[PDB]
Point group: D3
Chain length 122, copies 6
């Protein structure tokens, strides 16, 4: 049976001047931008590395255009350390998303700056 | 004992071209922009009017700079129809925020475009 | 646009003889009774100051007559440190309510003695 | 091995004059008062029969004196139709409790009038 | 009014070779097997004694044949330390169940080996 | 940067003789057994196709040996329609797991029969 591709990205969050900074690293330890191109059906797994001491946990992934069909689903682990995107790469196009996190310092949700997914179907 | 001001804003969400559009109205029924100036301690109450048929519910209010002290706390009702901001208007400045909503069509979170709160202390 | 009033009350909880005692203070640090009169639309914000060492968190606000229309809605923060009442002060009358809290010592919910809200519309 | 007693009570909730009325029935279909005497270790199982059309669900059982040791624990089913009290009947005395329920009409919690448990150890 | 029987079982969980082992004890401190015979309507209360240092909490009780009517309901305490089974012992027969637990080491659920309930109605 | 493999399995659940039957299908529509061999780091995505009319939702994936390191993490979607396993395929060996589901007919959790994951590292 046909398999897709599984991509793995670490979401490192530090504090600079009291506020969160999101640094993505790839499987080689290379800093990468937030943008991903998807060229076949698959998954994108984001692992949280919270270095802020603010108790960050993923609560989901947010979209300004959530019905565009670029990302099919979001799954989250019980400890808020992992989020995964399912992308069946049927609908071509681009979508902008932001990570949504809770914190233990206050009751405000934390948003990352926007990142982009580009689908190029097969 | 000293009282603050309570502001009330309706968050009307429609669909245009399949995607959500956020229209804020004030207590007079006037369309207003998302930006609010806070000139003393108080609360801002947002009531969801979901006209999308996508089962939107508030899940919180998100901030790219959540530790800036502009908004002190966020409260949410059990049905996801109300969110309230507490703003003690001690720390002057401006912060950008986006509403975060769940939907019943898919498992992606919905984000509004950004809005601004400006604190001018007394 | 028309604004309402935002009232702020601290809910101090101590232990006397092993059991919780609720002491309300107002914005001046004055001990006040639990009763509030509402004379226009607005909000009431309750901040938990738990001095019990029993891990108290708000889980809601309870009413024996919940459909009386005196309080329109209750919102709660994610950390259980704040609850807010929305009172549009359209329907005149009085309602009795009790704070509902979880604790970390056991699986029983904690109730405050009853307090009253009196609505006097404009 | 030693067994305790399991008591079963139906919590019938109707609306009279728009507001909830709690009617307890016992295993014979007899209306009973809310008060129970516990004369050995055991459980009390409360089954919700909501006749209000307000979508009531148990969310817990509340106590003004939650650390008195009369009731050891509360368990709740996932559908909010059952709550159970564990009473090891070690500590003698009496405690007053109220059922705490959510509803689908508004975001206020619903409280029953108080009921009493009397422990008489063996 | 007619009463049933309340049974009490402690679910002791240790680690052997890095993995959980479930040891049931009865009200006398005797190790018992997981199997219970129910000969009249009643409850079975399971208390978690987690000796693993893996932060185990009950999240429910699972069944391969959940619609067989042997167990009528499951209730759980807010701290995940207690689960209770309601067994009205109307439908005779046997059912196999496993405890379902969360842990704080990872995001996998923990299952006990299967145990059996045998109903013998009156 | 290095990518893994993403596998996709549909979890079809029917009722036979009143009880759930789990039928797995692969990306070709072929019925497959529950067992999967993992030969490099990647993800396994399970999509629920509930044909039971019992309101099944995934609540997690359970393991009798949850600390064996075969599966690194489980993620779940907000609607309970998807669960995903992360398998970094570092630790070789085999583990047995069961799907854990809630239902809307009763408060018992639903377990699948066991399935196996076999890790063969690279």
């Amino acid at each position: 049976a046909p398999q897709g591709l599984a991509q793995f990205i670490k979401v490192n969050v530090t504090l600079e001047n009291g506020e969160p900074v999101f640094i993505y690293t790839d499987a080689n330890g290379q800093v990468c931008q937030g943008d991903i191109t998807v060229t076949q059906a698959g998954t994108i797994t984001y692992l949280l590395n919270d270095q802020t001491l603010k108790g960050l946990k993923f609560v989901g992934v947010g979209f300004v255009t959530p019905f565009d069909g670029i990302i099919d689903a979001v799954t989250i682990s019980s400890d808020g350390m992992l989020v995964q995107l399912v992308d069946l790469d049927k609908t071509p196009g681009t979508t902008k998303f932001q990570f949504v996190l809770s914190n233990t310092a206050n009751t405000l949700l934390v948003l990352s700056p926007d990142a982009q997914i580009i689908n190029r179907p097969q």
